[PDB]
Amino acid sequence: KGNHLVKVYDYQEDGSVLLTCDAEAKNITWFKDGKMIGFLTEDKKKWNLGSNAKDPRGMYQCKGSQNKSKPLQVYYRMCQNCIELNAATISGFLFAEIVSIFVLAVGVYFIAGQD
Amino acid sequence: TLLLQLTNTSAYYMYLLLLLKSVVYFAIITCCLLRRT
Amino acid sequence: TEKVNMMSLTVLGLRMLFAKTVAVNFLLTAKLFF
């Protein structure tokens, strides 16, 4: 293992990730960026980070009865907020940034003429 | 689908930008109407 | 596949909000001329 115990389990039906601290001990202690952000009791071994849809980043580690384990930086770019900037969206942006402005201006012209 | 996922958010932001102009025009007309009361 | 449906629902909701924010502005501007 070489003092590398933290692993990530994936490839399941749902979109979730689980940190697996592969170290024999009791009352394992989870960290994040060196701080005390989480804790765990028995009857559960895989810490939950949430869904892969919310891009769980960070720098996670665990600690058993022996010395503290070694970290494992997790990066997840499951963006799902990405917009395709091809030659159709930018054209759609311009055609929606001109007609609306023109209608607003042709309304303001009449408003000012009334005033 | 990776095409519909992008298509939906390429129109969600477009309609989120045509809603911040209707509010501006509503503010303009409200300011122009409150001067007559 | 459980978030594309929510995105489509939100887009429909924004379309429905826009179709009323246009009507409000049009009605007020018509009032401005009568």
């Binding site: 159709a88 929606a96 007609v99 209608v103 | 095409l3 519909l4 298509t7 129109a11 | 379309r15 179709a19 246009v22 049009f26 018509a30």
Partner: peptide, 28 residues
């Protein structure tokens, strides 16, 4: 193609509705 048709049909319908509202209200 099919999903993109709705987001451009709504615009033309909206413009037609606004134009026909404005031209109908002209008769007063």
């Amino acid at each position: 193609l099919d999903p993109k048709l709705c987001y451009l049909l709504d615009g033309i319908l909206f413009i037609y509705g606004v134009i026909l509202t404005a031209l109908f209200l002209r008769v007063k």
